Amino acid sequence: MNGPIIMTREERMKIVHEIKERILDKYGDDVKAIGVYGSLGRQTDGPYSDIEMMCVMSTEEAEFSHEWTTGEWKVEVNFDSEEILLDYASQVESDWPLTHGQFFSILPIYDSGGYLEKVYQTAKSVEAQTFHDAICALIVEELFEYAGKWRNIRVQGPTTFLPSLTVQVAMAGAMLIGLHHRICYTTSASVLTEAVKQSDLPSGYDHLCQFVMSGQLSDSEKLLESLENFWNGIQEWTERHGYIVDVSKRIPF
Amino acid sequence: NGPIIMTREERMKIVHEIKERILDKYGDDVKAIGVYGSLGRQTDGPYSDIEMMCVMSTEEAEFSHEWTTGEWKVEVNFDSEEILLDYASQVESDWPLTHGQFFSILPIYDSGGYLEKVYQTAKSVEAQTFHDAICALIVEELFEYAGKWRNIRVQGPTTFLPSLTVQVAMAGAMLIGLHHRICYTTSASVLTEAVKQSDLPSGYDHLCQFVMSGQLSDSEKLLESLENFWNGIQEWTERHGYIVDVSKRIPF
Ligand SMILES: NC[C@@H]1O[C@H](O[C@H]2[C@@H](O)[C@H](O[C@@H]3[C@@H](O)[C@H](N)C[C@H](N)[C@H]3O[C@H]3O[C@H](CN)[C@@H](O)[C@H](O)[C@H]3N)O[C@@H]2CO)[C@H](N)[C@@H](O)[C@@H]1O
Ligand SMILES: NC[C@@H]1O[C@H](O[C@H]2[C@@H](O)[C@H](O[C@@H]3[C@@H](O)[C@H](N)C[C@H](N)[C@H]3O[C@H]3O[C@H](CN)[C@@H](O)[C@H](O)[C@H]3N)O[C@@H]2CO)[C@H](N)[C@@H](O)[C@@H]1O
Ligand SMILES: [Mg+2]
């Protein structure tokens, strides 16, 4: 196994078409729709991209996947009932900017009646409060946790974890920016490039991303200073935008 | 301006306050309360957070409370016994990172040996379950990462390569952890502990040195080291019998 190999958009779409025909042969009238997502769904696949497909099933509670390789390429096909998929499309977790681009990159190849459009409409109709709640949770569950981790590094090591942690913090900041602007990143490779192009960023985020994007992550004292500056920027930014809960009680339940 | 420095004694006082609040609020629905993470191992450092797990009698109970006081952070998970036991027996690609929880339980309340049952379930997973998880990890994570860095080589962007190299090093550490059936003690020690294990895929140690040193700016070298690690994976699976099925064009 030395793949993935170089492939063209034909070669991927021919494979997609074979999988579509197999899906219709096996599941028949239980298939409501078949779509391609990811880079191939956006028609921006590169020489080595994988193949990602989504199937909407009429079957109650249907929820399964097939993910395999031929040694030369890799495919993932998800099969979901309409209710299960629409519920997922309306959920906003901390990595929503990374996961839900799927629903804004659908290439419809089979649809028995407006199913893929309903998925898209569901993904785009999330209410403002849902994003607000997700942002407040991200600050506590990810950023505050990371701040404790790098401050532990400062006082007790290990600095060998600091480059990886700095990458994680830059990614969490990108999730924060994506939730705030209600944008999903096109690919994993463009997350940081797209994040630093947005407006109204927390102070210090650009400098942090400069280390991560250049790969100059060996000066631990500079990384710690950059992380602290970003953490200070988070405090001013969340206060300015109202992403604040009462934290005065030791136990808030 | 937090998190602040705290002592283990201070953290345990907070834990016991939370224990009393859980018993006051949820009463006889509480089967057990435990501390996990660094505090559960009694190796918490100056800035560590507080992580607690509760076993509930309510069927389908699955919720959490996660908050900060500005100065420290607490996460409390509440699960029914079956939900927790089911999760404790599942081996996903990040099992070496997630299931250390079940080998770090400090019981602080237990009405019927429940936390011991959780530990026994986590430690009794069969060898085939790890074999399946390793084969899935190669297909679902490592093969995907290989396509991503090969795309970078031909079309960019190299600005993603440091982050991707960190991800690949972590995925390799998961592979090693699944093979040796070990859970890493802390998030910070994953890479240091992984490269000290036996049976490493060739090229993995060298790749990790870039990630641990933070020397991630030489893009040609990272790409060469990623390819060498990917080749090391192909031997490593053959040597240890983790054979991935590549015979079906469409496996359904
Ligand atoms: N399918 C719709 C919904 O998917 C959910 O699961 C989501 C998520 O956990 C799941 O993640 C799955 C894993 O599991 C599996 N072990 C490997 C697989 N590559 C990964 O796939 C996902 O993560 C990759 C990056 N890491 C992405 O590249 C990929 O596009 C994405 N589908 O993919 C789903 C998102 O597409 C739930 N299953 C359910 O709410 C419902 O079925
Ligand atoms: N609790 C037992 C089981 O946990 C599962 O979820 C697991 C996982 O998704 C979940 O992850 C949760 C997130 O969700 C939540 N939004 C933020 C929270 N800090 C994070 O916590 C987890 O990830 C952190 C590192 N990032 C770890 O430091 C932390 O110890 C760990 N509990 O924590 C659970 C493991 O403790 C399922 N909920 C369910 O099968 C059952 O409840
Ligand atoms: Mg946590």
Swiss-Prot record, chain B:
SUPFAM superfamilies (UniProt xref): Nucleotidyltransferase, Nucleotidyltransferase substrate binding subunit/domain
Broad enzyme group: transferase
EC number, UniProt record: 2.7.7.-
Stretches for region C-terminal domain: 127-240
Free-text comment about domains: Bilobed; the N-terminus has a 5-strand beta-pleated sheet while the C-terminus is a helical bundle.
Annotated positions binding kanamycin A: E66, K73, E75, E140, E144
GO aspect biological process, one term: response to antibiotic
An example Gene Ontology molecular-function term: nucleotidyltransferase activity
Active site: E144 (proton acceptor)
Taxonomic lineage from the root: Bacteria, Bacillati, Bacillota, Bacilli, Bacillales
Protein name: Aminoglycoside nucleotidyltransferase (4')
Cofactor(s) of this protein: Mg(2+)
Record keywords, A-Z: Antibiotic resistance, ATP-binding, Nucleotide-binding, Plasmid, Transferase
Residues that bind Mg(2+) B: D49, E51
Transferase in keyword set: yes
Natural source organism: Staphylococcus aureus
Thermal response of activity: Thermostable at 50 degrees Celsius for about 14 minutes, at 55 degrees Celsius for about 2 minutes.
SUBUNIT field: Homodimer.
Described function: Inactivates aminoglycoside antibiotics such as kanamycin by catalyzing the transfer of a nucleotidyl group from a wide variety of nucleoside triphosphates ((d)ATP, (d)CTP, (d)GTP, ITP, TTP and (d)UTP) to the 4'-hydroxyl group of the aminoglycoside. In vitro, antibiotics without the 4'-hydroxyl but possessing a 4''-hydroxyl group (e.g. sisomicin and gentamicin) are also modifed but with poor specificity. The 3' position of the NTP ribose ring does not tolerate large substitutions (e.g. ddATP) and dNTPs and TTP are better substrates than their NTP counterparts.
Other comments on record: Although some of the cross-references in are mapped to other bacteria, they are probably all derived from the gene originally encoded on plasmid pUB110 in S.aureus.
